Amino acid sequence: AGECVRGRCPGGLCCSKFGFCGSGPAYCGG
């Protein structure tokens, strides 16, 4: 669960260039 649309993802979390969303050092980087 958690996918980005055209490079935009709400909720207040991170979005990966592969088209995904997530919080913490997983989809954010560092």
How far is the CA of 7 from the CAs of 20, 22, in angstroms?
9, 13
The angle subtended at Cα 28 by Cα 2 and Cα 20, nearest 5°, is: 25
Side chain identity at residue 27, one-letter code: Y
**Other CB atoms within 10 A of residue 15 CB:** 20
The DSSP secondary structure of 1-30, one letter per residue, reads ----BTTB--SS-EEETTTEEE-STTTS--
Domain encompassing residue 12: 1-30
Q: In this structure, what token pair is assigned to residue 6?
A: 């055209």
Q: Work out how many domains the chain is built from and give that number.
A: 1
